[PDB]
């Protein structure tokens, strides 16, 4: 029985001094990195002057020697130019020239191009937009482009189409690639090889998603090596061509977390390719990728350079990125490795290609700092400093200075001095981009320094995949190539020496003023939680020890009453991944003590309510500091008690910290003496986020001034007990926070207790409905319903159309469906694939499914852990077997024998014929897949809505018309565009749904605390300038009927309503996070008096809703002669259960009438209804008798604006 965490994340090899110096610099503050780089990059005044002169000469030559020309000839707008290139791209998909030329001449030119061209013409328009305009738009306005294409064809006809086709053919066949195939690329390289250039070929292709795709990339590299080696014909590694490879192409799980697989499976493949490169004596360069792959790649480089089978060949090459803070230390390591191995490693120094993505990832992950610089000039200094280090080691490495920056080039040219021979070092550039500059460098007439051209090879399709990222290295406002074209930029500015510019700044190395450190994402509002970097070996080593220490601790959970711990029945808590691993002991609460706890809470309520809100919020902030400091220990407990992976446990602790700090800040923004607490609040939480959801509900209740009875899920009491311990340590009094471990009976006993003033429930819809029924019997002492927040299940869909990028879709689907073994309320349950792309995506998804490692979660290499109990496993497996029995195709990963000691369900994909094949939420790792024809998209959205759930929803498309359509028609609380549908972040994606998925208000949102006080405050930013027009028509009708006071109240409701609020919430770069307030739907109105009905109708209409009015009220004659606009929103209901689902209810009556109606409402099928009740006298006295906060629906939408390949804003 393996000891906990004994094999958590052992490194590939013991970390040498040189390796640890690399790791130490991973996230070093920018002000610490720059001073030594400035020192190393300094050159003499004579050299600086000579370099400036050379750089000026080069820039002058560049400025004194396509799409623009076409746009000019035909007077095309930008959209017309983009649309034309999209059309040319589509036309070039037609393989035969004569067939294409006839379609153009007889059909496309002669009008309806739509008629003749399952995929939008405009799927790649973001790329063509970059070509035409130099600007990147994340999504495509396909209606604008369709209009522009019709306009340009109808205006200019076949000639413009001809020119567009020829232009696109040249760009895609000759400019963006050296050739479509390696043979074609080789044939086209002869011309510049005769002029003194060399080549390194890049077979466009990165990121294998499946074993089969990695195998295809391997055979593509192997075949390219043969062709390059044959062509090289003994020219050797310096004069002759080489190949560049990306390691992520060669294995579908190239990551530190899968290091053992990488060394066991990827390394041999690289070795095989290297052996072939050695036999032909060509270069083989390992390209550099994301920052979290840098150190892993060094382990492969070390093994290859020490492998005797590769001896005698100096062609092994390796890229280092100067924008990275580790660059100089990586170079020290490589130079030393070259010395030890005797291999003259070819070192390609680049600035770096992933900058935008690195900024976003570090922000998302809450890490201490960025692994790259944030000011471009810093990268330039780093590049020059690293060049100095390389030029001092030309006996042991071969430096390759890959840059198009003439100032960088000139600085290095003079740095290297007058002694040169081929093989000492070289420059490099990209095909189709750098030849203008390097034709001023290569040859005896110029600077007589060689340049190797990096030559992309691939078909149009492969080309377009990552062409945006390629372009951005030269369109950004910071890019040299962009500046050298800007006539507003002088040569003097271009030849400015970055070393001296940085030296003379006030703070050397200061972070970019406009990029927030991850901790500062929310500015002055609150401190972002901090995560942990599972690619950092120091972090892994420290975490290994803390995790082991956490498993030695004697975790317990006890009934913690106001008077002290209570006795109860005690049992062990077992690790779901291995029942032999006892995590702790829980003592469960008797029903008697649960009732006693509520009485103690009631008697302590005044003392807690009297703690000022700012001091209550200070307790939450202190608790957040404590959880942040304790995160490693908390991780270990969550991993073992709840079966979570480390990555997911980190995110969970972060979320708990974020809840605490968010509700503390919301309190500081809102709560005052008139926002009185409800009283004792029962907080019932689910097992699956046993710290974060548990903490969030309790923290909210507490900071609003209510004492809390915390009832954690029976599966996960230990982390709950630790969260309560932390909150108490932070200053929450024991009387204000009591912990009552146990099962649903303890929850039910708490709900039923007379002094319970409010219930916060997160869990299954079915249990919420039992709680709703129990509360329907109850009124507060004031005669009003006991507030219930019930956040429940989902049946979450993602719709994918033919414009989406399969690899992105698969990654987001795998994460959304199978992260946490699907045990997230937000998890993807139904993937909907447009018919034309379904087979290809499904094949890739199945391939990716089989790369997942399922097992006990105390190993970093585990992707998917167990399900929480044998009962959950049995429930999920019954569903799978029923589906399989109906003949549905079922794909499942095979589980290792070691899973037998726990309760595991393999990730499973089930192909359904119709969405109706699914009945209720299956809370496990089970993805259902349906296919749809594009014309049936609207009906599909209907089908998604028809389940009655409304939690998370995803859409993958590049097309704005589809975004607008689907997002306007879907009815769900959390929407996600071009990203996964999980991991909603507090205050950024306020989380919670509608229908069967929740009552709201959303946790982690601004309306939440207001539900936990008797008088809701006005939340921050909560207002709308928009007035519902039906409300206005109703107010006019009231005035016409002589209901003057009611008409005034209706106008007031129209103004007070926040319907139409539309906000962007601060968050990470590369995402737009929106928060909007919409109508809830159809509100059930149960009036008693005419004036009550008018107030109810005003409240509902002002918040955009329709209504169903109780026909038993007898008030039909009070609504005679309604304007048709209002009548369309009004129905009368005799049988409420037939006319739903409703989305809320408004009730007027005395206490016993309210209780009776509340019981009738609870009995309605379907969603829990948020009911508000008032007496006729309260309606007369209190304009807010019905609070408009609870008559709107919150919607959060998160759009990945980097999905097109990069981040335009940055």
Ligand X SMILES: N[C@@H](CCC=O)C(=O)O
Ligand Y SMILES: Cc1cc2c(cc1C)N(C[C@H](O)[C@H](O)[C@H](O)COP(=O)(O)OP(=O)(O)OC[C@H]1O[C@@H](n3cnc4c(N)ncnc43)[C@H](O)[C@@H]1O)c1[nH]c(=O)[nH]c(=O)c1N2
CA 782 to each of CA 110, 678, 1151, 1174: distance values in angstroms, whole numbers, following the listed order: 76, 11, 8, 10
| Contacts to a copy of itself from residues 1039-1058, by CB under 8 A | 1039, 1047-1048, 1051, 1055
Q: How many CB atoms lie within 10 A of CB 999?
A: 26
Angstrom distance (rounded) from CA 745 to CA 741: 10
Category of 985 on φ-ψ map: left (φ > 0), alpha (ψ -120 to 50) or beta: beta
- The partner in contact with residue 288, picked from ligand NAD, ligand Y, Mg ion, none with C-beta cut-offs of 5 to 8 angstroms by kind, is ligand Y
Residue position matching structure tokens 């869909």: 797
Is 376 near ligand Y (CB under 6 A)? yes
Least separation in angstroms between residue 794's CB and ligand X is 8
Q: What distance lies between CA 1182 and its chain's CA centroid?
A: 44
Member of 333, 454, 687, 1190 binding ligand Y (CB under 6 A): 454
Least separation in angstroms between residue 68's CB and ligand Y is 21
Dihedral sign computed on CA atoms, order 1197, 1202, 1208, 1210? positive
Angstrom distance (rounded) from CA 100 to CA 520: 55
Member of 726, 984, 1065, 1195 binding ligand X (CB under 6 A): 984
Q: What is the DSSP string of 1158-1189?
A: HHHHHTSSSS---EEEE-HHHHHH-TTSS-GG
Beta bridge partners of 571: 586
Which residue's CB is nearer to a copy of itself, number 572 or number 1055?
1055
Least separation in angstroms between residue 758's CB and ligand NAD is 14
Residue position matching structure tokens 């990339």: 217
- The partner in contact with residue 687, picked from ligand Y, a copy of itself, ligand NAD, none with C-beta cut-offs of 5 to 8 angstroms by kind, is ligand NAD
Q: Which residue number is nearest to Mg ion in terms of Cβ?
A: 1164
Member of 344, 824, 879, 1155 binding ligand X (CB under 6 A): 824
Q: How many CB atoms lie within 10 A of CB 618?
A: 18
Member of 883, 963, 988, 1119 binding a copy of itself (CB under 8 A): 963
Angstrom distance (rounded) from CA 1071 to CA 376: 22
Instruction: Answer yes or no: are the C-beta atoms of 391 and 425 closer than 8 Å.
Output: yes
- The partner in contact with residue 1018, picked from Mg ion, a copy of itself, ligand X, none with C-beta cut-offs of 5 to 8 angstroms by kind, is a copy of itself
| Contacts to a copy of itself from residues 985-1024, by CB under 8 A | 1003-1004, 1006, 1008-1010, 1012-1024
- The partner in contact with residue 113, picked from ligand X, Mg ion, ligand Y, none with C-beta cut-offs of 5 to 8 angstroms by kind, is none
Which residue's CB is nearer to ligand Y, number 251 or number 348?
348
| Contacts to a copy of itself from residues 142-171, by CB under 8 A | 142-144, 146-148, 150-151, 154-157
Which residue's CB is nearer to a copy of itself, number 281 or number 960?
960
Number of shown-chain residues binding a copy of itself (CB under 8 A): 86
- Residues whose CB falls within 8 Å of the CB of residue 117, separated by 6 or more in sequence, listed in order: 87, 90, 91, 108
Q: How many CB atoms lie within 10 A of CB 304?
A: 23
Instruction: Answer yes or no: are the C-beta atoms of 531 and 654 closer than 8 Å.
Output: yes
Is 115 near a copy of itself (CB under 8 A)? no
> What DSSP character marks residue 1050?
H
Dihedral sign computed on CA atoms, order 354, 359, 360, 363? positive
Is 899 near ligand Y (CB under 6 A)? no
Gaps in the chain following residue numbers (C to N > 2.5 A): 65, 117
Q: What is the side-by-side strand order in the sheet with 564-565? A: 564-565, 560-561, 737-739, 708-711, 681-684, 758-762, 788-791
**Listed ranges 304-312, 376-384, 559-567, 978-986: which one lies at the site for ligand X (CB under 6 A):** 978-986
How many residues are there in the chain? 1210
Instruction: Answer yes or no: are the C-beta atoms of 350 and 397 closer than 8 Å.
Output: no
- The partner in contact with residue 983, picked from Mg ion, ligand NAD, ligand X, none with C-beta cut-offs of 5 to 8 angstroms by kind, is ligand X
- The partner in contact with residue 658, picked from ligand NAD, a copy of itself, Mg ion, none with C-beta cut-offs of 5 to 8 angstroms by kind, is a copy of itself
Which residue's CB is nearer to ligand NAD, number 763 or number 1070?
763
100 to 139: interface string for ligand Y, x by CB under 6 A? ----------------------------------------
Which residue's CB is nearer to ligand Y, number 297 or number 1014?
297
295's tokens? 């150190």
By the criterion CB under 6 A, which residues form the site for ligand NAD?
684-689, 693, 711, 713-714, 743-744, 747-748, 751, 762-764, 767, 770-771, 791-794, 825, 921, 923, 951, 991-992, 997-998
Angstrom distance (rounded) from CA 722 to CA 1117: 60
Which residue's CB is nearer to a copy of itself, number 630 or number 675?
675
- The partner in contact with residue 982, picked from a copy of itself, ligand NAD, ligand X, none with C-beta cut-offs of 5 to 8 angstroms by kind, is ligand X
Least separation in angstroms between residue 669's CB and ligand Y is 34
| Contacts to ligand X from residues 146-205, by CB under 6 A | none
Is 473 near ligand Y (CB under 6 A)? yes
| Contacts to ligand Y from residues 675-694, by CB under 6 A | none
- The partner in contact with residue 763, picked from ligand NAD, a copy of itself, ligand X, none with C-beta cut-offs of 5 to 8 angstroms by kind, is ligand NAD
Least separation in angstroms between residue 244's CB and ligand Y is 7
* End-to-end CA, the chain: 51
| Contacts to Mg ion from residues 1157-1176, by CB under 5 A | 1164
Which residue's CB is nearer to Mg ion, number 688 or number 1207?
688
Is 701 near a copy of itself (CB under 8 A)? yes
484 to 513: interface string for ligand Y, x by CB under 6 A? ----------------------------x-
Which residue's CB is nearer to Mg ion, number 790 or number 915?
790
Is 475 near ligand Y (CB under 6 A)? no
CA 603 to each of CA 514, 704, 736, 747, 763: distance values in angstroms, whole numbers, following the listed order: 51, 17, 10, 20, 29
- The partner in contact with residue 438, picked from ligand NAD, ligand Y, a copy of itself, none with C-beta cut-offs of 5 to 8 angstroms by kind, is none
Is 695 near ligand X (CB under 6 A)? no
Which residue's CB is nearer to ligand NAD, number 42 or number 869?
869
Is 689 near ligand X (CB under 6 A)? yes
725-759 burial, b if ≥16 CB within 10 A, otherwise e? Answer: bbbbebebbbbbbbbbbbebebbbbbbbbebbbbb
- The partner in contact with residue 292, picked from ligand NAD, ligand Y, a copy of itself, none with C-beta cut-offs of 5 to 8 angstroms by kind, is none
Which residue's CB is nearer to Mg ion, number 78 or number 869?
869
Which residue's CB is nearer to ligand X, number 785 or number 993?
993
| Contacts to ligand Y from residues 329-368, by CB under 6 A | 350-355
Is 659 near a copy of itself (CB under 8 A)? yes
Least separation in angstroms between residue 48's CB and ligand Y is 17
SS (H, E, C) 883-945: HHHCCCCEEECCCCHHHHHCCCCCCEEEECCCHHHCCCCCCCCEEEEEEECHHHHHHHHHHHH
Beta bridge partners of 162: none
Angstrom distance (rounded) from CA 1106 to CA 882: 40
Member of 56, 512, 1026, 1041 binding a copy of itself (CB under 8 A): 1026
Q: What are phi and psi of 563, to 5 degrees?
A: -95, 0
- Strand, coil or helix: 973: coil
1001's tokens? 């208000």
What is the contact surface with ligand Y in residues (CB under 6 A)? 287-288, 319, 321, 323, 350-355, 372-376, 378-379, 402-405, 408, 428-430, 454, 473, 478-480, 512
What is the contact surface with Mg ion in residues (CB under 5 A)? 1164
What is the contact surface with ligand X in residues (CB under 6 A)? 688-689, 824-826, 982-984, 991
């Amino acid at each position: 029985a393996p000891a906990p965490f004994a094999d958590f994340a052992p490194p590939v090899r013991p970390q040498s001094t040189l390796r640890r110096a690399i790791t130490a610099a991973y996230r070093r503050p920018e002000t610490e990195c720059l001073p030594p780089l400035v020192e190393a990059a300094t050159q003499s005044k004579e050299i600086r002057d000579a370099a400036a002169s050379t750089a000026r000469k080069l820039i002058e030559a560049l400025r004194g020697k396509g799409v623009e020309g076409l746009v000019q000839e035909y007077s095309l707008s930008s959209q017309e130019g983009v649309a034309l290139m999209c059309l040319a791209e589509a036309l070039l998909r037609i393989p035969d020239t004569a067939t294409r030329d006839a379609l153009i001449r007889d059909k496309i030119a002669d009008g309806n191009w739509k008629s003749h061209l399952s995929r939008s013409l405009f799927v790649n328009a973001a790329t063509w937009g970059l070509v035409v305009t130099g600007k990147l738009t994340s999504t495509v306005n396909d209606r604008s482009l369709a209009a522009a294409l019709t306009r340009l064809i109808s205006r200019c006809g076949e000639p413009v189409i001809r020119r567009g086709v020829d232009m696109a053919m040249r760009m895609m066949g000759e400019q963006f690639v050296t050739g479509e195939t390696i043979r074609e690329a080789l044939k086209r390289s002869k011309e510049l090889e005769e002029k003194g250039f060399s080549y390194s070929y890049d077979m466009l292709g990165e990121a294998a998603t499946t074993a089969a795709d990695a195998e295809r990339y391997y055979r593509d590299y192997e075949s390219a090596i043969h062709a390059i080696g044959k062509a090289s014909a003994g020219r050797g590694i310096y004069e002759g061509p080489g190949i560049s490879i990306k390691l992520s192409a060669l294995h579908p799980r190239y990551s530190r977390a899968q290091a053992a697989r990488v060394m066991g499976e990827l390394l041999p493949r690289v070795k095989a390719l290297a052996l072939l490169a050695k036999n032909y004596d060509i270069g083989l360069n390992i390209d550099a990728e994301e920052a979290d792959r840098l150190e892993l790649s060094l382990d492969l480089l070390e093994v290859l350079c020490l492998d005797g089978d590769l001896s005698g060949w100096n062609g092994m090459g390796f890229v280092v990125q100067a924008y990275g803070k580790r660059c100089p230390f990586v170079l020290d390591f490589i130079i030393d490795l070259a010395r030890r191995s005797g291999r003259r490693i070819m070192v390609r120094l680049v600035k770096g290609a992933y900058w935008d993505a690195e900024i976003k990832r570090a922000q998302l992950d809450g890490l201490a700092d960025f692994p790259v610089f944030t000011r471009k000039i810093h990268t330039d200094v780093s590049y020059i400093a690293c060049a100095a280090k390389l030029l001092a080691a030309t006996d042991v490495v071969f430096p390759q200075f890959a840059t198009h920056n003439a100032q960088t080039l000139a600085a290095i040219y003079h740095m290297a001095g007058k002694d040169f021979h081929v093989g000492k070092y070289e420059f490099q550039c990209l095909h189709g981009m750098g030849e203008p500059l390097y034709e001023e460098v290569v040859g005896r007439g110029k600077l007589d320094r060689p340049c190797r051209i990096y030559a992309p090879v691939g078909t149009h399709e492969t080309l377009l995949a990552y062409l945006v990222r390629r372009l951005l290295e030269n369109g950004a406002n910071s890019s040299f190539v962009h500046r050298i074209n800007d006539p507003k930029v002088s040569i003097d500015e271009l030849i400015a020496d970055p070393v001296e510019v940085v030296r003379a700044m006030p703070v050397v190395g200061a972070k970019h003023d406009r990029i927030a450190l991850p901790a500062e994402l929310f500015g002055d509002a609150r401190t972002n939680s901090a995560g942990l970097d599972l690619s950092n070996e120091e972090t892994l080593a420290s975490l290994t020890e803390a995790l082991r220490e956490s498993a030695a601790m004697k975790w317990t959970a006890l009934p913690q009453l106001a008077t002290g711990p209570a006795a109860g029945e005690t049992r062990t808590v077992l690790n779901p991944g291995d029942h032999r691993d006892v995590v702790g002991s829980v003592t469960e609460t008797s029903e008697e003590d649960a009732r006693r706890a509520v009485r103690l809470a009631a008697d302590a309520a005044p003392d807690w309510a009297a703690v000022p809100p700012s001091e209550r919020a200070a307790c939450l902030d202190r608790a957040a500091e404590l959880m942040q400091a304790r995160m490693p220990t908390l991780l270990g407990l969550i991993i073992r008690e709840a079966g979570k992976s480390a990555l997911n446990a980190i995110a969970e602790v972060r979320e708990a910290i974020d809840f605490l700090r968010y509700y503390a800040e919301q309190t500081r923004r809102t709560l005052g003496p008139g926002h009185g607490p409800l009283g004792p609040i029962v907080c019932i939480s689910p097992w699956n986020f046993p710290l974060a959801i548990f903490t969030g509900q309790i923290a909210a209740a507490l900071v609003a001034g209510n004492p809390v009875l915390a009832k954690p899920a029976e599966e996960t009491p230990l982390i709950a007990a630790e969260g309560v311990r932390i909150l108490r340590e932070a200053g929450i009094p024991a009387s204000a926070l009591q912990l009552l471990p146990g099962d649903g009976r303890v929850g039910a006993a708490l709900v039923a207790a007379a002094e319970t003033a409010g219930v916060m429930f997160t869990g299954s819809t079915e249990v919420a409905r039992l709680i709703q029924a129990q509360l329907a019997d109850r009124l507060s002492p004031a005669g009003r319903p006991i507030p219930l927040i019930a956040e429940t299940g989902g049946q979450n869909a993602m719709i994918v159309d033919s414009s989406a990028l399969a690899e992105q879709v698969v990654g987001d689907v795998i994460t959304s469906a199978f992260d946490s073994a699907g045990q997230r309320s937000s998890a993807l349950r139904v993937l909907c694939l447009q018919e034309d792309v379904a087979d290809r995506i499904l094949t890739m998804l199945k391939g990716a499914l089989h790369e997942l490692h399922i097992g006990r979660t105390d190993r970093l290499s585990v992707d998917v852990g167990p399900v929480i109990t044998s009962e959950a496993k049995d429930n999920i497996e019954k569903h799978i077997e029923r589906m399989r029995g109906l003949g549905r195709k079922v794909e499942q990963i095979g589980l290792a024998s070691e899973t037998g000691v726990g309760t595991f369900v393999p990730p499973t994909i089930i192909e359904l014929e119709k969405l109706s094949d699914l009945q209720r939420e299956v809370f496990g790792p089970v993805l259902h897949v349906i296919r749809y024809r594009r014309d049936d998209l609207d009906r599909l959205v209907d089908d998604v809505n028809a389940t009655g759930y409304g939690l998370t929803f995803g859409l993958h498309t590049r097309l704005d018309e589809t975004i607008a359509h689907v997002t306007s028609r879907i009815k769900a609380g959390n929407l996600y565009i071009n990203r996964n549908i999980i991991g909603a972040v507090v205050g950024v994606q306020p989380f919670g749904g509608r229908g069967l998925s929740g009552t709201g208000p959303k946790a982690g949102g601004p309306l939440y605390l207001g539900r936990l006080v008797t008088t809701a405050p006005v939340p921050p930013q909560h207002s709308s300038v928009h007035t519902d027009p039906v409300l206005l028509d109703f107010a006019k009708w009231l005035d016409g009927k002589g209901a003057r006071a009611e008409a005034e109240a209706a106008r007031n409701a129209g103004s007070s309503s926040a319907l139409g609020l539309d906000l962007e919430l601060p968050g990470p770069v590369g995402e737009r996070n929106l928060y909007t307030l919409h109508a809830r739907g159809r509100i059930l109105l149960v009036p008693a008096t005419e004036s009550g009905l008018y107030h109810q109708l005003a409240a509902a209409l002002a918040t955009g809703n329709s209504v169903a009015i109780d026909a038993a009220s007898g008030l039909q004659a009070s609504l005679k002669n309604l304007p048709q606009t209002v009548g369309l929103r009004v129905s009368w209901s005799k049988d409420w259960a037939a006319d739903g689902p409703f989305a809320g209810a408004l009730v007027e009556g005395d206490a016993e009438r309210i209780r009776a109606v509340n019981k009738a409402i609870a009995a309605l099928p379907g969603p829990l209804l948020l009911v508000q009740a008032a007496s006729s006298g309260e309606i007369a006295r209190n304009p807010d008798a019905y609070c408009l906060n609870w008559l709107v629906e919150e919607v959060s939408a998160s759009i990945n604006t980097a999905a097109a390949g990069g981040n335009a804003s940055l």
